[PDB]
Design a protein around this nucleic acid. Structure first.
Lengths: 44, 88, 62, 102, 76
RNA sequence: GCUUCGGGGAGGCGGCAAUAUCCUGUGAUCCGGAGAUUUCUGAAUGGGGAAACCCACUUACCAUAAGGUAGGUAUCUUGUACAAGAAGCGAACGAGGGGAAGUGAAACAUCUCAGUACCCUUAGGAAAAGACAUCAAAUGAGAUUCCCCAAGUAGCGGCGAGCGAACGGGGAGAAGCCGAUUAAUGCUAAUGUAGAAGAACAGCGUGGGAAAGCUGACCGUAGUAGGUGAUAGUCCUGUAUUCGAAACAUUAGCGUUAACAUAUUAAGUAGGGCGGGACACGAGAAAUCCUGUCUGAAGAUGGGGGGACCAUCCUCCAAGGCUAAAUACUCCUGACUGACCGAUAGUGAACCAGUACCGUGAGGGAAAGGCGAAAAGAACCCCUGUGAGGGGAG
RNA sequence: CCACUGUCGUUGAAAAGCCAGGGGAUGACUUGUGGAUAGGGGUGAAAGGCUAAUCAAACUCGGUGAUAGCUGGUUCUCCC
RNA sequence: GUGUCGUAAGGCAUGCUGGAGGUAUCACAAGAGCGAAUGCUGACGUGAGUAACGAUAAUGCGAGUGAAAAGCUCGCACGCCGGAAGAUCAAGGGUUCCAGUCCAACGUUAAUCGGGGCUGGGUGAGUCGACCCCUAAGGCGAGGCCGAAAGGCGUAGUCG
RNA sequence: GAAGUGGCAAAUACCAUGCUUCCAGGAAAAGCUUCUAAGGCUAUAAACGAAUCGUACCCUAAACCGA
């Protein structure tokens, strides 16, 4: 049957992408928190 | 300028496609800069192989392959190559 | 090597750098086509180009 | 660093204790002196290169502290010291006697 | 925002206290009003969002005295 | 990786990780100071955008073709369409604006948790506070902050659960002013960032190997350091000790320059009503402080406080602004330490770890160290598929 | 596009399917792409349905080592 | 492992293995003693060489290569799909595409074969698509309005 | 070294964004053609150019979403 993920690149970069994170105060807090953990992947 | 055209051509391509094209249509296949346009390639070949006139340039970006080695996953540089046609 | 480059005029340093850039292409082609036995000219040529562009910046600034 | 390439040394520790030789190569803390501390190497043959192979006997590195400079006069192991020459030259000097040579 | 320009009056926080002494967070808002103040020194009506305490300050100090202090403070 | 200034003196072209071409006393590699270069994204700032991309305009120069080189072009704030700033990121500590609930009360609503978690704004090496409109009531004291007591006292409290002072004493540090500001520059002094020298052991026996055994020496302002083929003051690197700086930060003293600031004694203020908040203090007999609303003085022949309130007495002058130290903290730099761990421990992470892996995402989150002293990592032969694996040899 | 009946499957080929039949099939239809509504909120031709295999209050992190008059467990030896 | 000693926890001695550390005595301090917590991590059992090997479209034989062939290559024949199980894309993926070479692991068996390992090659546009111009829904949004702060909304526009 | 032209049948594709009907009344903006406001254009040709990114391969699937 139809599963849950169903990928779309434009939809992925537009709801979780770098510029989507940087366009809100809380999205920049997400990025700061990924950087403090040292994650090699900030944004999808 | 004339100090950027020396960095357009990175090296000729030696393969079965490049060797078969030369013998039949006399088109040179080169590995070119990752930023070289068709105009720069045209101006680099005729400056640097004196006596030849380029008809056309066909360029393409080809992506490097992921060649794992040891315990690591690593990929080869992507690169740009050009087919250049010379006047018969 | 740098001794006989420090007393060259700006006009002839730019003119000398041009051969070194053109020489860089010839090494690149010769190396790829298997005509470069001594594979240490490429390194010294790159350093020489770096040396020339360092001097050019100096004689253009001071 | 107190022992260079070429100087005659005597090995004062190990299986070759008491033997002499000239230093062939100095690494950070290991020394290779020709003639002593030779090992049996089973060299695997290869056609790509020119080296043949076989059972080869080659001198190996040993710790730099197991060898000492050999005094040229007393023919015995001595240490090395430096002398700040007023002329502006620094030379290694035998600890025991104290002459400039080596 | 909902602040007075001349007095600095802004909302205060406090408690709603019931007879059983139950406490809930509330706010106290300033008595802010929009008034067009006549300014003889400029032959013009300047319209300010002011509290009723501010009006008494113009009544006692004058609009000219208040207006320069507003300009000195910033927003004009 | 380029240049220069210093150090250093024989090897070197980072690691896995070797090989090749080579470099190096015409001083390499390497270490320290300064400089130059510094693609694109990102505050990202020429416009846009699905970050590492797309599209531009403009000035000057060059080229003649379909371009090049060097710039300029975001927004806001402060000054005369022109200059100077700001932006964003990053530990904890500070100040400030908002502010829970789990829980406890053996239920639960007042209360507690707790002004905590969290959210938000913003600074400095600290911040805040700070010189009396303060206490005290003794023979008076004399700013602020922090520590030990006072004291789990006095109080507050469905007077329950709990909350919980102050006066004053002993200390640390002390300072009071009306610019105790900020930023540059130049001298003077001291550090810091590479370094250099640095003593003194032999013989014999065992042993793969000596540092351990036996005998006898030596240095010590250097004897409990790390290594070295087993346990070394005398083998190495070191240690005690004595010292170097061309260059550039840093700290302090003097001088100069330019930015800002420089109150003159304080009215919508003190006080009051109403509703709240803070005080240890839950309206209580509730002083004192804060203020959303409504009001509102006296103004030195005066006013605030001394815990309802009045009188007397004492004390002090709000409605101007500042002020070092003692105090809080650790992303960090150095030196040193540990009756701290030793690979299921200690950081999640000793290892290519915030990785693999899981998740749309926020986010969650592993496993995994050790040949040997030295690769001397087993030439060659044999079985097998020129495989795996083994047996010889070494 | 659905999902009415049955068998099968139930450590499945499948964390909802297959097979044999079944319903709608020009419409209040089905479907691609992009966008909007966010947690006591949303959306719901209404089943407390659905809101990422999670729903009478999502998920992640934090308060947090919530509390647990409850259940389980509680590690050497001998003497009184 | 063995012997021996003590009421016990346990001590001592010693053979082999091991190859670089250990620690009397007396004090002192504890991450101080494990069989259970449907405890936690790793390893390994039993079930058991059992179920199963994933659509019942289907295979047979001859050569080749190979250490080895039911499965690979070639050939003849047979069977299945054929509004697909054939072709072109978009989405998504990212080298899986082609050749040579290898068969440890992966492939639910074998494998000489492979979407597996390794080494090379391969994607050529004025006309196809993107980019570009334009706009929809919907975003962001000089100034503007509103709001303790954070921010919410919104015009011209600017994206989409 | 060959042929390569006649009949018939015939799409859901094209004419057709047409036509006829009905109500539930059917995007926007630009490219393009014309008009002027403040203040070069049209024909003829000749030469030269049209950048950059994608392009392999699967895609009713063993390559995507389902470990």
């Amino acid at each position: 049957m139809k599963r849950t993920f169903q990928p779309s690149v434009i939809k992925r970069k537009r709801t979780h992408g770098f510029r989507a994170r940087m366009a809100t105060k809380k999205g920049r807090q997400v990025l700061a928190r990924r950087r403090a953990k040292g994650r090699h992947r900030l944004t999808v | 300028n004339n100090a950027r055209l020396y960095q357009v051509l990175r090296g000729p391509v030696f393969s079965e496609k490049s060797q078969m094209l030369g013998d039949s249509l006399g088109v040179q296949v080169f590995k070119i800069d990752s930023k070289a346009t068709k105009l720069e390639v045209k101006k680099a070949v005729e400056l640097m192989f004196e006596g030849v006139e380029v008809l056309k340039v066909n360029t393409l970006n080809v992506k490097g392959k992921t060649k794992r080695f040891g315990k690591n996953i690593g990929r080869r540089n992507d690169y740009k190559k050009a087919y250049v046609t010379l006047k018969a | 090597k740098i001794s006989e480059l420090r007393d060259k005029s700006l006009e002839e340093l730019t003119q000398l750098l041009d051969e070194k850039q053109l020489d860089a292409f010839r090494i690149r082609m010769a190396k790829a086509t298997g005509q470069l036995g001594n594979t240490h000219e490429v390194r010294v040529n790159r350093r020489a180009i770096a040396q020339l562009q360092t001097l050019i910046n100096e004689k253009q600034r001071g | 660093s107190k022992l260079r390439k070429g100087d005659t040394v005597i090995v004062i520790a190990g299986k070759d204790k008491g033997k002499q030789g000239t230093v062939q190569a100095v690494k950070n803390d290991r020394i290779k002196v020709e003639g002593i501390n030779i090992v049996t190497k089973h060299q695997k043959p290869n056609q790509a290169t020119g080296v043949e192979g076989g059972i080869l006997k080659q001198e190996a590195f040993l710790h730099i502290s197991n060898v000492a400079i050999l005094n040229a006069q007393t023919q015995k192991a001595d240490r090395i010291t430096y002398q700040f020459g007023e002329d502006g030259k620094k030379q290694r000097v035998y600890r025991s006697n104290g002459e400039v040579v080596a | 925002s909902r602040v007075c320009q001349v007095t600095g009056k802004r909302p205060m926080v406090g408690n709603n206290v019931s007879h059983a002494n139950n406490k809930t967070r509330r706010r106290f808002l300033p008595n802010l009003h929009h008034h067009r103040f006549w300014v003889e020194s400029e032959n013009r009506f300047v319209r300010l969002r002011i509290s009723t305490k501010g009006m008494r300050i113009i009544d006692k100090l004058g609009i000219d005295k208040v207006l320069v202090d507003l300009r000195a403070q910033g927003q004009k």
